[PDB]
């Protein structure tokens, strides 16, 4: 048996455990037999190339399957009535009524109705026909092939990079900040100005004419003259019909703010100036570190020099440079945490400030996008803490980190875990007490006895952003404030028009139910943080098992002795925290979906009255909205929801199997 | 649908021939000494 060639101990296993453990440790290159650091980094580089190629192939497949089996050319003409098709159905297990019931979207074959929102994104960025969708799919197929060839090439001899190249922090930071963040943002701003904005105004720009169709009538002369504000003159009129020249402007860079009144999305000129500014800022950030020419900052000196002289941080950040450069797991935890934070930011900001035309009216698409990226956020944050725990198990050197910030985390880990436990128990005791209190007093016929705390802090924040609903009369909701007079000439009219109109998801009105569900969310975040931080900080050892670092990151137990040691490893803390992460994203998505359905129905008072007690959540959200789902198929017939009606039950099966 | 024969050709192939050969060859690889 030589399937796990990377593990001799696994390859000599005479049982079926060999296949499973070879499957689960196949990409754990650090634990393989005779792995050196240079080989480790080169394999990681090629695997990263392969994942990039996989992403490009998936996006090219989406583009191709739309150009072949979609209705994009029909959907561009009538975006608010035509149902977007994701891909075609060919299932030979279908009967004829299932063939009939899935034949939607104006086509003659069974199709699935798209929830990914690729229609709105591709339409907003200037695609109109099926031909350019296919051309983009071809370009991404070619790009994926190029990255596959690069992954093969950068593993070949006399191209394998050294460990000094991989650990060049300053060069990689400068190039990735200035080029990968900055120049990519500048090029996307260029694409918006050169292609997307003219196609939004009904004038076709492609590769055949983009060198002769100027983005602005004055050309690049106002840019080279320093008269940049000419690019801000004549913006799109409030009568503009998207994708046509009717009511179109000539501006390419504005900061108008708010939403386009027809698409209910952000102005494309605002997006172009935003990405241009982001490119300029990031290129300025990307000239910071010294690589070959004497100027620039040194990362080691910055880390060692920032030690507070009062001694409260100990030695400060001395030794963090070598600890971070030598540990890929510490880097992976930092990257996953930051990525999770920003995909949470994407999820909140894209429903609150949509950028794609007509996507604010696609309720299914908004729900799917929010739920998807929030679950991705929970997975990324859990992975960040898990791989930080792996960094403590495998890579943490105390002797290289004497009196460091990491060492001082370890020296007051007990205080951190105890205070996290205290705040988690605090939040859970009183949040559950208020919810159960409200349930008991509503069941006894006295809803006036409920404990309903108005969320005045967040309402004050909304008023500071300009919401005049609550009458706080402060900052942007005050017509005499210095912030109001400062921003009155630039962005205040459009922002105030968008924030004070109850037709969007911009700073939605909030009540006691919103208060309770955010404090429940705080409870769940603090408790998941408690589990994950306690797993990471006790990964090296505890009073029950002081030599845990000798046993690795993952092991079953330490036996029934010493009282019993079930689930004592940090991997087991990951395993316990996964349920709490699922609970937290469940609570967040339940709140988001119930609030948005009640606003979209024009029945927001149902949410305002029913979200303060658990029975309202169970009856008016779970039970009430389950009726079309459980009627996807019945003894009287079936319709297009039936697959979800299957999948729902499927979930109820497979979840139980996990138990 | 242009080239409508392609779903009816490829879906049985991708769903029955590809996994059967993949499971057979992976079985042969993981069980051979």
């Amino acid at each position: 048996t030589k399937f796990p060639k990377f593990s001799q101990a696994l390859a000599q296993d005479p049982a079926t455990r060999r296949i499973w453990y070879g499957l689960a440790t196949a990409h754990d290159l650090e634990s393989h037999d005779g792995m050196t650091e240079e080989n480790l980094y080169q394999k990681i580089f090629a695997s990263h190339f392969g994942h990039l190629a996989v992403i490009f192939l998936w996006t090219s497949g989406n583009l191709f399957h739309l150009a072949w089996q979609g209705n994009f050319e029909q959907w561009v003409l009538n975006p608010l009535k035509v149902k977007p098709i994701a891909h075609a159905i060919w299932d030979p297990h279908f009967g004829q009524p299932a063939v009939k019931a899935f034949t939607k979207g104006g086509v003659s074959y069974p199709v699935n109705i798209a929830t990914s929102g690729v229609y709105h994104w591709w339409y907003t960025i200037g695609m109109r026909s099926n031909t350019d969708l296919y051309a983009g799919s071809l370009f991404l197929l070619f790009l994926a092939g190029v990255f596959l060839f690069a992954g093969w090439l950068h593993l070949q001899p006399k191209f394998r990079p050294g460990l000094s190249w991989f650990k060049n922090n300053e060069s990689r930071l400068n190039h990735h900040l200035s080029g990968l963040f900055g120049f990519s943002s500048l090029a996307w701003s260029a694409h918006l100005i050169h292609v997307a904005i003219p196609e939004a105004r009904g004038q076709h720009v492609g590769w055949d004419n983009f060198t002769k169709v100027a983005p602005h009538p004055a050309g690049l002369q106002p840019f080279f003259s320093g008269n940049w504000g000419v690019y801000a003159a004549a913006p799109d009129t409030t009568n503009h019909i998207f994708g046509t020249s009717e009511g179109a402007g000539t501006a390419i860079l504005t900061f108008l703010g708010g939403f386009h009144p027809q698409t209910q999305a952000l102005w494309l000129t605002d997006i172009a100036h935003h990405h241009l500014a982001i490119g300029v800022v990031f290129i300025f950030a990307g000239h910071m570190y010294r690589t070959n020419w004497g100027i620039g900052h040194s990362l080691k000196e910055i880390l060692d020099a920032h030690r507070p002289p009062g001694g409260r941080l100990g030695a400060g950040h001395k030794g963090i440079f070598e600890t971070l450069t030598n540990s890929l797991h510490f880097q992976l935890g930092l990257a996953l945490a930051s990525l999770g934070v920003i995909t949470s930011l994407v999820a909140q900001h894209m429903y609150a400030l949509p950028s794609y035309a007509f996507i604010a009216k696609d309720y299914v698409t908004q729900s799917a996008l929010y739920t998807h990226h929030q679950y991705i956020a929970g997975f990324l944050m859990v992975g960040a803490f898990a791989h930080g725990a792996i960094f403590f198990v495998r890579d943490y050197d105390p002797e290289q980190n004497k009196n460091n910030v990491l060492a001082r985390i370890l020296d007051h880990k007990e205080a951190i875990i105890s205070h996290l436990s205290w705040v988690s128990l605090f939040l859970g005791f009183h949040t559950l007490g208020i919810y159960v209190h409200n349930d008991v007093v509503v069941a006894f016929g006295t809803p006036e006895k409920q404990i309903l705390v108005e969320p005045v802090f967040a309402q004050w924040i909304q008023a500071s952003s300009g919401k005049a609903l609550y009458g706080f009369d402060v900052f942007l909701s005050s017509s005499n404030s210095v912030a109001t007079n400062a921003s009155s000439n630039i962005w205040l009219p459009g922002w105030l028009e968008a924030i004070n109109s109850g037709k969007n998801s911009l700073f939605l009105p909030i009540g006691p139910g919103d208060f309770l569900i955010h404090h429940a969310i705080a409870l769940a975040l603090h408790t998941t943080t408690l589990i994950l931080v306690k797993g990471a900080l006790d990964a090296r050892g505890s009073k029950l098992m002081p030599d845990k670092k000798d046993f690795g990151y993952s092991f079953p137990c330490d036996g029934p002795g010493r009282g019993g040691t079930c689930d004592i490893s940090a991997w087991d803390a990951f395993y316990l925290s996964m349920f709490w992460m699922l609970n937290t994203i469940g609570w967040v998505t339940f709140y988001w979906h119930w609030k948005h359905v009640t606003i979209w129905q024009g029945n927001a008072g149902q949410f305002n009255e029913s979200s303060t007690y658990i029975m309202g959540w169970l009856r008016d959200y779970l039970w009430l909205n389950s009726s079309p789902l459980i009627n996807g198929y019945n003894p009287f017939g079936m319709n297009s929801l039936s697959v979800w009606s299957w999948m729902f039950l499927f979930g109820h099966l497979i979840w139980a199997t996990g138990f | 649908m242009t080239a409508a024969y392609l779903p009816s050709i490829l879906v049985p192939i991708i769903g029955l021939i590809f996994p059967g050969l993949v499971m057979a060859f992976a079985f042969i690889y993981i069980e051979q000494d």
Binding site: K43, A67, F142, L148, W152 | -
Partner: peptide, 30 residues
């Protein structure tokens, strides 16, 4: 709309990507 020849071109590019992916997998497997 898209024609048969365009789908065939996409299939040829995907086969080229398959060959490159097989080569990358063999290179990673040592």
């Amino acid at each position: 709309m898209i024609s048969d020849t365009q789908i065939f071109i996409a299939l040829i590019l995907a086969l080229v990507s398959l060959v490159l992916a097989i080569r990358l997998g063999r290179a990673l497997y040592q």
